Amino acid sequence: FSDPDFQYLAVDQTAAFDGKKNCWVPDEKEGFASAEIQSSKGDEITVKIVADSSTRTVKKDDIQSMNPPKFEKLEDMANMTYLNEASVLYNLRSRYTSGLIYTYSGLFCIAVNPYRRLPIYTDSVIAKYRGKRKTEIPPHLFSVADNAYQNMVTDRENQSCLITGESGAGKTENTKKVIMYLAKVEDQIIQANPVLEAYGNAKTTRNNNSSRFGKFIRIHFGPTGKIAGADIETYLLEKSRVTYQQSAERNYHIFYQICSNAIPELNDVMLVTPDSGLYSFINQGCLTVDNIDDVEEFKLCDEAFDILGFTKEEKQSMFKCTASILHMGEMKFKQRPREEQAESDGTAEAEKVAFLCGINAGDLLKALLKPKVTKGQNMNQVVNSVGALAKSLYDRMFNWLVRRVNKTLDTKAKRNYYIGVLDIAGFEIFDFNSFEQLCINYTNERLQQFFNHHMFILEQEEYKKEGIAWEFIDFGMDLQMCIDLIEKPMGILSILEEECMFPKADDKSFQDKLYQNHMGKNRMFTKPGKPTRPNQGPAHFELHHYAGNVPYSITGWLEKNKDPINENVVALLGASKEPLVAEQTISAVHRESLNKLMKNLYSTHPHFVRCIIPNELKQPGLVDAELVLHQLQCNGVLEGIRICRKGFPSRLIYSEFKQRYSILAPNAIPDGKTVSEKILAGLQMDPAEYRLGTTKVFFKAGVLGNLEEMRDERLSKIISMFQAHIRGYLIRKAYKKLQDQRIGLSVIQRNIRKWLVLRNWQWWKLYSKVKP
Template sequence: QTRVVKEDELQAMNPPKFDMIEDMAMLTHLNEASVLYNLKRRYSHWMIYTYSGLFCVTINPYKWLPVYTAPVVAAYKGKRRSEAPPHIYSIADNAYNDMLRNRENQSMLITGESGAGKTVNTKRVIQYFAIVAALGDAPGKKLGTLEDQIIEANPAMEAFGNAKTIRNDNSSRFGKFIRIHFGPSGKLASADIDIYLLEKSRVIFQQPKERSYHIYYQILSGKKPELQDMLLLSLNPYDYHFCSQGVTTVDNLDDGEELMATDHAMDILGFSNDEKYGSYKIVGAIMHFGNMKFKQKQREEQAEADGTESADKAAYLMGISSADLIKGLLHPRVKVGNEYVTKGQNVEQVVYAVGALAKATYDRMFKWLVTRINKTLDTKLARQFFIGVLDIAGFEIFDFNSFEQLCINFTNEKLQQFFNHHMFVLEQEEYKKEGIEWVFIDFGLDLQACIDLIEKPLGILSILEEECMFPKASDMSFKAKLYDNHIGKSPNFQK
């Protein structure tokens, strides 16, 4: 096949000695084609890590590679970057040694689109610190060591916070910032986790070819039969509307085995049986929420329950009265001024209320789970410095994008802006040190127009917040305000 290209589209090729080079900053001709070609050549030989100046580029191999074993960890411990092939362990080791040498906290930003491998690499970084800075087992300790607990925090959070999306079978639907604290001697002292932006809409709605959170399907796998009796559930996901609007299985993923891993992780983290089964009960209650039925009263604007079986099961699992639950949904108490009044609801309003309650309940349960994990990881040992690892949900564009996905994409955009700007500034400092004459252009601010459109006063989020305050606001009134403020005024805003 012959393709004719214009001369100005041609770019210089690098000499053969640069083939599969480990640091692309060394290329004689640094252009997009050269970068992509080098990454492709290395990837074809399963070299998934490549340096590019100050940072490390990773390509997801979508298969297990033997590059994370204990001997590999040992090979990178205390080594300078130039002494071993590119690897996430080298980045982690440099951060660890910079912390000890400079007596300063360090942070690692792991960024990329959904499915790029951010969460896996975050786990590898944590595994590295857990091995090189291990405290060792405390004698007579019943639970796992601190190293074990830090590593097991991931499967516990992933069960409740990860899901299959169109682009990624194990997509993190929340962001997390993990701080690994070290004592004065550089040994592990403790850890804590902050979470952001859990995608609550997934609790009640999934697109075709997607799933809700893994924990639903783990519970319904039948691997722990006692859960079916305890949670009053069948084993068929399609019996539960809130978790069966997309697919219910994932290729090459055994939900039963994953349930055992989740259960084991919670045991290692010191969860009591009441705490562990309490979490499962809330997940079960939310499944029953999705099956509650309502109908309109004749000649009235008021809804009523159409059977109470699902409400009875949900209320039982949450330890509340079924009658109170139904009453709260059908006749909620609303504060007006200093008084409470009871207001009626039609069927549509009640269905919205059930969805809102399910989302809020799941969100609070997830936050409680992370708080409980932090309680275990807080050892009260002396801590001096920390290394922070940021792993956020990846950038994705769907046919139908949730509000949470807008927030996730916006966060990615801001982080990419910070990353680009920071890297250009650091590179400029390198040039100054080497005495290179250089006209500085900061491409790191190229994303500002899009960021302003979303976050500035009278931006998308500001207008949305304002519309939420108006009783008669609708999707159409929100859209009209966006058009009035941004059509023809914001380059990134189009119909």
């Protein structure tokens, strides 16, 4: 439209294209290659690669139909002739290398990570997307958000966006832009991310800012359609990162912010020396982070605590408890050759800890080396309960922190409906995978299957409900299994959960008790295979997850699932001086949180966002077709589009249908659901072009346009017929006048001729004369 605001948003296409020569042939580097057939030979087709101009043969049933230049960089792929793994990958990759990272796949959106900042989120751009209908303006995430708003409003129901994708794709960035969008059409809301991300994110090999907790944020709206409140829910924070961090990875962001000197004034409040590589608990893996300024992030994080409305004490309570942790791990120890119970190796660092938590350093190390009926601990039983404490504190801080930020957002204003946004942590496969990952992965599964349900299983159901017409289609997309292998009655987790309650148990009775149940009785469970990446640590079994095969090491899974902090120290802290500090298995608990989340989701009109990681190098604008193509597979994109093209997108409530299409067979209408049964029956309508429904009618594509055709026609006729009626009334009205005047004239004509001839009568003449 000439609008500068569309530089990286609007698509910028002819000749050399033979619909019978040109096709898609499998490739190892690009996934699919542009080929031009040369010679058939039964099944052995011989094509020429347009690129290098090399030649090769390919099974005939492995060629894919290419799309004509008519659909270059198409905005909506459901409108393409061919929706196959090679047409889709080509369209995306086409757009992507041109700045366009958003594309509709039918009813849901596709976002391909830019790995660079784009001027497409400005307020200038937001102005243009407001109240726009998806086809009206280029593809954009705003459009998805803007539309969910309109639906909640007009349709009067809750909306929801499940933004999915792999780890490092764009789930978080896009979730934030949605809120930022909905907020712009408030300040604290936007400001809750900086603090939650500082405490629940960390550098990882995959993501320099990896989210380590699940986030579901609902945004409430009032009677004038404006933001009237908001709440946040979080899930499974990586308690483990606190004390441990695999190489090339960092601990949570805060810890590094705290040791930068963004606010020197605070150094003495926390008792920290501005050196991160000084504290064991946070210098295991990485220290710095290409493109993350811990100095400035600390400032902004501090700045954000203010805007959130945090008293200075409150926000110093936070900072201290977390700096305290930086010390729990500095407390050295020793034995004392004899019994070993264990003795300390100083007390300097163990005091700073008791200090910051407002408890006696004495009473501490005491209830830590001989927990009370007493029961002393050895030299490791201690260093490990130290970690048990660090982890458990941080899990309470993070939880309290969220409760508090909701305090600031649960405005008691008036709520109508809302729009939630789900950002759950995605699939991730590392060199070594353990309980933490199974949990994240089980989580991500789960979700995918939701899309499968609501997308295929679902669509057809409604067709039935409304009572339209249709024949089923098996898209073969179910993971209930994988899901089942992990969650169901005797599943993986259920086995582990019943294994924790036994003090006798260990990493081997658990490992054996597992094969005992699923080896060979479920094909998703398979003995560990062979290395597909160097440094590939131990693996005890493999799971075939939607987006990958994961070799899981089950060592230490028993303690990881049953938490364990000296019930003693919990007493110390129970009555600590600091006001903050003073204030079921994990598996079962989480399984439950998750089930509850899912339950909350189902009651929604979902709009889906699909994130896609362009490559394994974290560099921008570079594509790895194999990987891309690979995602366009485990995510169900293509199929996700077939039904949009295949299916019955119409839908009408018999109440509004009877009112609009009764006038098409009124000589058959003596209940809104039967009246229509009649109308559409009268019209001798093909059972094909429509379907039943409980509360609504489903008309195949185009049909409704054609009904509005017949609808007009009749409405025009009828209007003519009433005009005919008016023509006939006026005519007949003036009928006497032509019969009446014919008489009324004969009177006058015959009755004047009389008075005329009577005056020409001698007698009358003479008579008239005498008169006087």
